[PDB]
């Protein structure tokens, strides 16, 4: 076929297996407790999720 | 098939029943143009209304339908012209075999013309 020359392989580990669910970036993904967010995206949506800066 | 093949005459009634009763059939049925597509269907009996215009030359790929007419019931009629047959059912090109299955509200005329062709020449 022809569309086979456009599909990516289904990776199970490595940096290529995880993307931010809000912007699609590869790299600095926060994996704690199942979050999948960049360090950039988490900073601006943290107050809505209920986190606070106590100290 | 082709005009240079004298099978029988050209009654007006057969053309009336064959060209003017597929526009009422297209809107409530499925269309299968083309000789090669229809050939397998008519060999397998999938063809129901085999309308054959005399526009295809040479006597190479037209020389299959008549010798296969005895192999099946093959209710078939002949079409005078190719220009508007596609306009009757399909697309605006020249078609030679518009075979359709289960047309809607075209039973009495089709049965009568099929009987007439059966008793006319086979």
């Amino acid at each position: 076929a022809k569309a086979d020359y456009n599909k990516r392989k289904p990776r199970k580990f490595g940096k290529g297996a995880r993307r931010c669910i809000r912007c699609g970036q590869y790299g600095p993904i926060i994996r704690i407790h199942g979050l999948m967010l960049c360090r950039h995206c988490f900073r601006e949506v943290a107050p809505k999720l209920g986190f606070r800066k106590y100290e | 098939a082709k005009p240079s093949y004298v099978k029988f005459e050209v009654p007006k009634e057969l053309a009336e029943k064959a060209l003017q009763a597929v526009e009422i059939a297209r809107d409530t049925g499925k269309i299968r143009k083309g000789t090669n597509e229809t050939t397998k269907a008519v060999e397998r009996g999938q063809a129901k209304l085999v309308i054959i215009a005399e526009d295809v030359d040479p006597e190479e790929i037209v020389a299959h339908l008549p010798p296969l007419c005895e192999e099946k019931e093959i209710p078939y009629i002949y079409v005078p012209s190719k220009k508007e047959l596609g306009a009757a059912a399909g697309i605006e090109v020249a078609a030679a075999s518009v075979a359709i299955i289960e047309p809607g509200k075209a039973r009495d005329l089709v049965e009568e013309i099929a009987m007439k062709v059966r008793e006319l020449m086979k």
Partner: protein
């Protein structure tokens, strides 16, 4: 062009030179490899004659 020939069909008799695949019905035709029945879509390692 046009591809419908090589079939022995006479004025009244229709018989196919190339058999159809046993998987499917009549009408689908094989190739003419001559060493094996190519079949196009099924393929057979039979050493046809």
């Amino acid at each position: 062009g046009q591809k419908w020939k090589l079939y022995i069909v006479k004025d009244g008799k229709v018989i196919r030179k190339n058999k159809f695949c046993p998987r499917c019905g009549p009408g689908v035709f094989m190739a003419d490899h001559g060493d094996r029945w190519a079949c196009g879509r099924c393929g057979y390692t039979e050493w046809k004659k």
